[PDB]
């Protein structure tokens, strides 16, 4: 069972992946889903990539996140090489060797956002709300559509995530309508990339009294 998406590839490079996929009989799609087993990132020679939605969702699903060099080197050697040898080591934002992709694959029985309830509040850009909500679900969070539906239950802890630069403002007034902590979206992305629930401290959005 295999199914791939690609990220950061040129059309010419995609075309080689398809040929590769076809020789080895691997399903290749445009969109990542629960069915997806492999995420092929464009990388440099040290297996460092850029952060894309597929990158985040590949890690969140505990999928294989491997260098495009996996494909090209396999083509040259005329056999399917070990995913383990081409796994992404890190990314250009959070560190060239954080090993987020390996950690997540091995850590699906102890998810970083387990026991949290998360609301993706207000506008977001370059990333639809439903994909952000989906990301944190894969990482174990409960999704809340509206601030007033946060569980008052000690069973789950609530967190509000917002992207301030999408606003035009009101995101300093969320703390007047509930007591849940308000952090930027970068808290999620960094948490997912590192596959480590980050301290809120550096991500907190100060609220108006």
């Amino acid at each position: 069972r295999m199914s791939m998406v690609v990220s950061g590839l040129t059309p010419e490079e995609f075309m080689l992946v398809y040929k590769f996929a076809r020789k080895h009989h691997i399903t290749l799609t445009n969109l990542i889903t629960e069915e997806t087993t492999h995420v092929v990132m464009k990388t440099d020679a040290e297996f460092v990539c850029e952060r894309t939605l597929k990158y985040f969702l590949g890690i969140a699903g505990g999928k294989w996140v491997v260098s495009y060099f996996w494909v090209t080197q396999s083509i040259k050697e005329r056999k399917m090489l070990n995913e383990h040898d081409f796994e992404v080591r890190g990314d250009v934002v959070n560190g060239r060797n954080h090993q987020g992709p390996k950690r997540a694959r091995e850590s699906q029985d102890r998810k970083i956002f387990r026991g949290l309830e998360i609301c993706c509040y207000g506008p977001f850009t370059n990333m639809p709300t439903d994909q952000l909500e989906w990301m944190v679900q894969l990482c174990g969070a409960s999704v809340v559509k509206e601030l007033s539906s946060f569980t008052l239950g000690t069973g789950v802890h609530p967190i509000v995530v917002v992207q301030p630069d999408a606003w035009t403002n009101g995101f300093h007034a969320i703390g007047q309508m509930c007591e849940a902590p308000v952090v930027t979206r970068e808290w999620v992305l960094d948490s997912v990339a590192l596959y480590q629930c980050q301290e809120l401290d550096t991500y907190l959005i100060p609220q108006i009294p």
Binding site: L9, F14, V93, M127, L189
Partner: peptide, 12 residues
Amino acid sequence: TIDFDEYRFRKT
């Protein structure tokens, strides 16, 4: 029809 102009999240 597949996407190519994926957005890259570089803090900012």
